[PDB]
Design an enzyme around this catalytic site. Sequence first.
Site, PDB file in Angstrom:
ATOM      1  N   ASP A  23       5.728   3.264   5.375  1.00 35.75           N
ATOM      2  CA  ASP A  23       6.340   2.156   5.850  1.00 35.75           C
ATOM      3  C   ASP A  23       6.455   0.907   4.805  1.00 35.75           C
ATOM      4  O   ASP A  23       6.970  -0.129   5.368  1.00 35.75           O
ATOM      5  CB  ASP A  23       5.758   1.763   7.264  1.00 35.75           C
TER       6      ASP A  23
ATOM      7  N   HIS B  30      -7.370  -1.356   5.708  1.00 36.51           N
ATOM      8  CA  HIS B  30      -6.299  -0.401   6.396  1.00 36.51           C
ATOM      9  C   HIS B  30      -6.116   0.857   5.229  1.00 36.51           C
ATOM     10  O   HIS B  30      -6.088   1.880   5.946  1.00 36.51           O
ATOM     11  CB  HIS B  30      -5.091  -0.993   6.809  1.00 36.51           C
TER      12      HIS B  30
ATOM     13  N   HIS C 115       0.939  -1.015   0.092  1.00 39.52           N
ATOM     14  CA  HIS C 115      -0.123   0.009   0.217  1.00 39.52           C
ATOM     15  C   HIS C 115       0.902   1.028  -0.023  1.00 39.52           C
ATOM     16  O   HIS C 115       2.114   1.246  -0.038  1.00 39.52           O
ATOM     17  CB  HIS C 115      -0.947  -0.101   1.245  1.00 39.52           C
TER      18      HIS C 115
ATOM     19  N   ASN D 218      -3.248   3.501  13.540  1.00 34.37           N
ATOM     20  CA  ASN D 218      -3.745   4.543  12.841  1.00 34.37           C
ATOM     21  C   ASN D 218      -4.684   4.098  11.811  1.00 34.37           C
ATOM     22  O   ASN D 218      -4.120   3.233  11.017  1.00 34.37           O
ATOM     23  CB  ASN D 218      -2.342   5.263  12.237  1.00 34.37           C
TER      24      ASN D 218
ATOM     25  N   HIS E 205       1.470   3.791   1.921  1.00 36.21           N
ATOM     26  CA  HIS E 205       2.081   4.559   3.166  1.00 36.21           C
ATOM     27  C   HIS E 205       3.601   4.158   3.180  1.00 36.21           C
ATOM     28  O   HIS E 205       4.167   3.486   2.389  1.00 36.21           O
ATOM     29  CB  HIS E 205       1.448   4.032   4.500  1.00 36.21           C
TER      30      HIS E 205
HETATM   31 ZN   LIG Z   1      -0.540   2.116   6.217  1.00 36.07          ZN
HETATM   32 ZN   LIG Z   2       2.127  -0.719   8.513  1.00 34.83          ZN
END
Ligand SMILES: [Zn+2]
Ligand SMILES: [Zn+2]
Length: 232
Positions: free
Chosen positions: A87, A148, A83, A179, A85
């Site tokens: 990280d 998520h 995804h 989050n 993000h």
């Molecule tokens: Zn994420």
């Molecule tokens: Zn993560």
Amino acid sequence: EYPTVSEIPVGEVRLYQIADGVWSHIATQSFDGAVYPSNGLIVRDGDELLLIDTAWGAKNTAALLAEIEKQIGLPVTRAVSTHFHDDRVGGVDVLRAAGVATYASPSTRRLAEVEGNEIPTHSLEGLSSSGDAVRFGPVELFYPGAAHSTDNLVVYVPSASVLYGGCAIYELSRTSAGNVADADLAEWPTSIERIQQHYPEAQFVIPGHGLPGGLDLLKHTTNVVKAHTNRS
Ligand SMILES: [Zn+2]
Ligand SMILES: [Zn+2]
Ligand SMILES: [Zn+2]
């Protein structure tokens, strides 16, 4: 024997053999005063390696490649980010520099762009609709629908029955939602049910963060997502 923030100096990466020719990589990152572990996957692809997800940032990711080079010694030829993000895509430039082909869905690429994150180079087609699956060498890539995040993918290794859930799946220790800023809480349980219905044979389930387990991590995540939905 699974590595905790215990045996991992912030800046270092450990590898963990889950099954034959499948490893998780584990890194740590500080955020908001706390220290979090984070998992990715490594899947042997003949005589090369497919990497799933960065090690959360440029330094971690250069340490991940060095630790692959030291401990497996096969070239990482492709990488998939699950995804948009940081990280999961943070470190993409490092991978590119090392000559890894970086991949994500168009959805993930668009979102990373909007976010101002690193953007994997290559696009993965045919994942745009909930329940879509595509083969990618020694793995199947599956888009369960929004959870998520709206673009999150899960990875299944048919040869070892390893389901890598990424951040869509929580470890058992995580008892409240993380989050969820970019999450689709309304669609998350439905998406997990698609994962359940598609991979009932999964023997090992790897959450985006924390300890591996079995298919009950899916039910667990549903339970946690529902409790958060019902907050008042
Ligand atoms: Zn994420
Ligand atoms: Zn993560
Ligand atoms: Zn390329």
